[PDB]
């Protein structure tokens, strides 16, 4: 999912 | 502090290829996701493309998909945005920036978003022969 | 994709008078509108996520509010410091931004 967390 | 310096801009002939660096200071580089952002003077602010925080995932806008590449070199703190395939709508000023939690950082929920902030200043990139 | 609409595009306003800009979604994006603030010569500012909650050291006199699709960005007190063009940025279904309004003030 792109508006996840990507950290 | 946080501090994120973009750099390589200038002129790139129409259908060429220009790489863009940017710098990260001030936290762990390679704990959080970054961005590509650009600003075109009359289409306005534009997402270009997201990295993960790994470099696992990296998901681009349907304009750059095949041109464009982001990348990142976790040891050297620094973004990457490989442009090929320049056209003369990629004429814009390109922010690198972290990205945030569109909430408060005790909030946990089932949908949580993420967004971007602290963007740098920005490289002016130019297409012109 | 998810189209975002500002209200409107120059706005002029006196110091101390209140001032607010609306900001449409074309559908239900929850909650999750940003607001930036970009002054001359510097890049955008986050100023307020979740369509009301401030960012840490913006000033009181900004606000937010949001019902469903339609946002908006609230001063108090205009000041000369808040010339600027403030975007709203939706970030439910990837990132996307408003046209902008730029707040011109009248003295």
């Known amino acids: 999912d792109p508006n996840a967390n990507p950290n | 502090q946080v501090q994120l310096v973009e750099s390589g801009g200038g002129v790139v002939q129409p259908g060429r290829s220009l790489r863009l660096s940017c710098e990260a200071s001030?936290?762990?580089?390679?704990?959080?996701?970054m961005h590509w952002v650009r600003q075109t003077p009359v289409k306005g602010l534009e997402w270009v493309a997201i990295i993960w925080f790994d470099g696992s995932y990296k998901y681009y806008t349907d304009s750059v998909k095949g041109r464009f590449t982001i990348s990142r070199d976790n040891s050297k703190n620094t973004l990457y945005l490989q442009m090929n395939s320049l056209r003369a709508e990629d004429t814009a000023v390109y922010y690198c920036?972290?990205?945030?939690?569109?909430?408060?950082?005790?909030?946990?929920?089932?949908?949580?978003?993420?967004?971007?902030?602290?963007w740098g200043q920005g490289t002016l990139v130019t297409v012109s022969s | 994709d998810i189209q975002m609409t500002q209200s409107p595009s120059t706005l002029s306003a006196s110091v101390g008078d209140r001032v607010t800009i609306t900001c449409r979604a074309s559908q239900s994006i929850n909650g999750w509108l940003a607001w930036y603030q970009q002054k001359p010569g510097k890049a955008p500012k986050f100023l307020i996520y979740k369509a009301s909650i401030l960012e840490s050291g913006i000033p009181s006199r900004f606000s937010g509010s949001g019902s469903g699709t339609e946002f908006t960005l609230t001063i108090s007190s205009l000041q000369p410091d808040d010339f600027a063009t403030y975007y709203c940025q939706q970030y439910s279904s990837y990132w996307t931004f408003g046209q902008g309004t730029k707040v011109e003030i009248k003295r």
């Open positions: 001030g936290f762990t580089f390679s704990n959080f996701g």
């Open positions: 920036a972290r990205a945030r939690k569109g909430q408060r950082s005790d909030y946990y929920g089932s949908e949580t978003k993420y967004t971007f902030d602290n």
